Design a protein around this ligand. Structure first.
Ligand code: 5B6
Ligand code: 5B6
Lengths: 511, 512
């Protein structure tokens, strides 16, 4: 009953899952906690800051570079002065993308402090684009109404009355009123089912997970969550959302009131590999449908590489690997080197509105320190002729083969292996009908994966965290230094886990 | 015409203002740029990360502590495990706030990565509170409609038809549910002050007055009403305008009426104790009393934004404590990162705090080990030696404000006012849109005046100042507490020079 000032409920919940541990040190793929006697217990980390730690915890190169930057008196706060490192970082990211996509496009960079902030830069810029489109359409409609009013009040044409269900001055004023309502309406964003794009006031609307989002629905523009698995259905859902404004269309003799398209949709967002969905990679059929939508609606396709970028999938850009051709791109997580906080929106230069450079800002964004560490991380992942990507791919193959070998002998409790590169997952089969009460009850609160993670922690000293909407997936996203021995120990631990779960051993799995 | 990949327009604009410089090193209150010959020129920094650097650039204690944390293998990414430092930081902030307000309240802490993110945690939690209130009101209305439907369809009462302009028994109920459903889905409102700056993300930007920053984005997110800080008598009625109501059936034994009940529209009130976007104006006691009334009246939380005013800047830890603003949530950022890392925190009073927020809100980088460690260092430093660091802020602030007043006094033709408190201070410039010099007048008319004048101060006196306020009509002075008497003299000399040239309308000298 002692006063508590943070984290009571969070900690209460972690304890009950068997995840109530304090890690006191970390290096590479290992975090250490203290046992009863006060010695350090090594735990293998497969969570790794939800995929932030492509180079592991506290990589000596990154640590050394950070300490050097600090000792050089790097200018961290230099707001509203020249900061070339921002242009330098963007030049690198531009070259990488050209190399990997074969496209010779150019991107402007705006920096921020988290993946959510970078996605919301993209939301904001998208809505700057949508406002341009809207200004132009309405300028055109003014003119159409000017022209049709010259035709009607001087001779040449008559107002066809069949179209009035949609007096000259009254019809125009009615058209302006209708169009004004429409213009002030909140836009729509399009996302995939299971999408995770952040949990701030704007981005949370873009994140499916229902208990995270639905409390906050009234605050900000919504998204429509398109069904990734059935792209045939997306056409019509998006067709539903079409809205139109009104104008007067002259045809020499006849004037009609007619509907024109209003730009409702500010952006489409996609993750190349869909973390909130259990690490499912976007299929070629889904990519082609997102291209169609982007071409059809004329809004930007925003590719969220907060998790899939910086080498994780076996290239720098997961979008490049899977052939997703976005207009904006976002990066965060691994770009901070496992130690600092940084993110970036890349916005194609032929779409980029220059006002954004001067009307958007952030105190911490583009700071010297995280700029310097960015350039380090980019140097590291690019080094030795792109060998680091090769290494991610061969480590990933190894880890996925293990995981497949485990599914194969445990398909009664494991449905699928998902993902690519070193961004992988096991889908757990539903256990809401489980024989063991305690397991069944946990399945029914959506806590299953956390319980199973607890088992792995206490019995095998392996740190795994669940992914997906009801912790129905187990995440495996270690650093590229994950050893063959560490992968064996993980196989042994999972064979153990899923054998106990086959045996419905509730006493052993739930505390 | 070479390819450019960031910042072209930004840099183009800074150059034309005379602020096109790259600082290559920083220490204390000094940043250094390289001249033509490649030597380091010291420049005195009065901007200091817009008030992030209460202890100056790269303070050796903070740098050392950071390097130690890095060398110890501090766990930066430990998501969904026990992280006591968060509770530890919040305990310290709680004790400080008790000491300074005399109130024995307790606050839960949720961390984030920027001031905007911390304000948006508060926006989210406020809207959780509003949804509780809404659920309760609508449960009550269900029951009232149940009761009035028992009265009408069995005997006792009749539906008074004088009240039907607000909308058959079943039809009136279905009409009431429809009306109430529209209302329930409506976006909430936020209340802010004129000139408010609360961040520039999708949610927070609505809460930031500056019109070119915000109005492009109006359709995205819930809006605010910007209340006139200077005339609190006017706020009552603006907020009255925003009242909205739902419908119910009220039984009075014999008679049933359709009646309006209050709907909770307002999710939160936000306030800065010292209002940066307004030119560093401190909230008056009359305005504080009006914000209390609103908070008591509406039953939504008052969110006190100490992203800038907190961590000692005003001469206490909490500016709110100094000026008697009794908020329900508090936010901190800027100086808590020690000038080197990124961190922020929302403190939400524990008797309002909804426990779901602890498990439905999260962030990858939030609550990381490194910025946690550096937070505890900063808090140790500002608290050290029996609260002497606050004393030092106050005496350095008095010194700097006295200089600035002395300068206004002999230059009241171009300076209207000194504003602010502690080491968060500003000069208000007089309008120059009627200036004799064409070049000055034109700059005044794009709202660039303060930036031009900052450029003068940079190139002619080697002093870094940045403007505040809606059309760069204020000059900010927010240095570290180590600002020396000599550095203050050099600033007086530089400003006397600046405002004498501006008196002389010397456009050639001020504008490039
Ligand atoms: C694809 C993608 N896009 C934007 C973001 C948002 O970035 P920030 O967190 O830096 O704002 C994330 C960050 N991912 C966070 C994450 C990923 C995950 O697999 C689980 C949880 C989690 C699960 C339960 C409770 C709290 N957090 N969080 C992301 O994965
Ligand atoms: C009171 C208050 N609340 C929340 C915030 C937002 O915090 P973050 O910037 O960390 O998101 C700030 C950050 N203030 C930044 C600032 C303060 C200022 O006086 C001028 C400019 C500025 C002016 C021009 C262009 C870009 N930035 N920026 C603040 O001052």
């Amino acid at each position: 009953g002692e006063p508590v000032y943070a984290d009571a409920v969070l900690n209460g919940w972690l304890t009950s899952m068997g995840l109530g541990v304090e890690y006191v040190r970390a290096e590479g793929n290992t975090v250490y906690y203290l046992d009863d006697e006060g010695r350090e217990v090594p735990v293998l980390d497969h969570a790794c800051g939800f995929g932030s730690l492509i180079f592991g915890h506290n990589h000596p190169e990154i640590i050394a570079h950070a300490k050097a930057a600090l000792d050089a008196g790097t200018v961290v706060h230099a707001q509203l002065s020249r900061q070339p490192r921002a242009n330098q970082i963007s030049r690198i990211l531009n070259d990488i993308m050209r190399r990997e996509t074969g496209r010779d496009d150019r991107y402007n960079a705006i920096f921020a402090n988290s993946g959510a902030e970078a996605n919301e830069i993209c939301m904001k810029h998208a809505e700057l684009e949508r406002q341009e489109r809207i200004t132009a359409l309405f300028a055109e409609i003014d003119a159409e109404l000017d022209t049709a009013r010259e035709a009607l009040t001087t001779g040449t044409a008559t107002l066809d009355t069949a179209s009035l269900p949609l007096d000259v001055d009254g019809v125009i004023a009615d058209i302006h009123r209708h169009n004004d309502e429409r213009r002030a309406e909140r836009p729509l964003f399009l996302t995939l089912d299971g999408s995770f794009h952040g949990k701030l006031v704007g981005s949370i609307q873009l994140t499916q997970n229902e208990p995270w989002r639905t409390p906050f629905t009234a605050l900000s523009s919504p998204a429509r969550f398109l069904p990734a698995d059935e792209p045939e259905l997306i056409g019509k859902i998006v067709e539903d959302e079409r809205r139109s404004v009104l104008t007067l269309s002259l045809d020499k003799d006849t004037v009609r009131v007619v509907e024109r398209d209003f730009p409702v949709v500010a952006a489409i967002f996609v993750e190349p590999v869909r973390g909130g969905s259990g690490m499912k990679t976007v299929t070629p059929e889904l990519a082609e449908e997102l291209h169609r939508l982007r071409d059809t609606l004329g809004c930007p396709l925003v590719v969220d590489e907060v998790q899939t970028g910086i080498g994780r999938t076996g290239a720098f850009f997961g979008s490049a690997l899977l052939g997703i051709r976005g207009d904006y791109y976002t990066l965060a997580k691994a770009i901070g080197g496992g130690i600092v906080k940084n993110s970036v929106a890349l916005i194609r230069q032929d779409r980029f509105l220059p006002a954004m450079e001067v009307i958007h800002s952030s105190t911490f964004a583009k700071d010297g320190l995280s700029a310097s560490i960015a350039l380090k991380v980019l140097e590291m992942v690019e080094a030795d002729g792109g060998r680091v990507y090769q290494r991610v791919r061969e480590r990933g193959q190894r880890l996925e083969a293990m995981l497949e070998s485990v599914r194969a002998d445990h398909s009664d409790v494991v449905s699928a292996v998902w993902g690519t590169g070193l961004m992988l997952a096991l889908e757990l089969r539903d256990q809401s009908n489980a024989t063991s009460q305690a397991i069944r009850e946990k399945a029914a609160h959506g806590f299953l994966g956390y319980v199973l993670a607890g088992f792995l922690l206490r019995e095998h000293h392996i740190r795994v965290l669940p992914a997906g909407p009801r912790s129905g997936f187990l995440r495996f996203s270690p650093s590229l230094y994950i050893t063959d021995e560490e992968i064996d120990r993980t196989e042994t631990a999972l064979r153990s886990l899923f054998t106990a779960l086959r045996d419905q051993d509730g006493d052993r799995l739930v505390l």
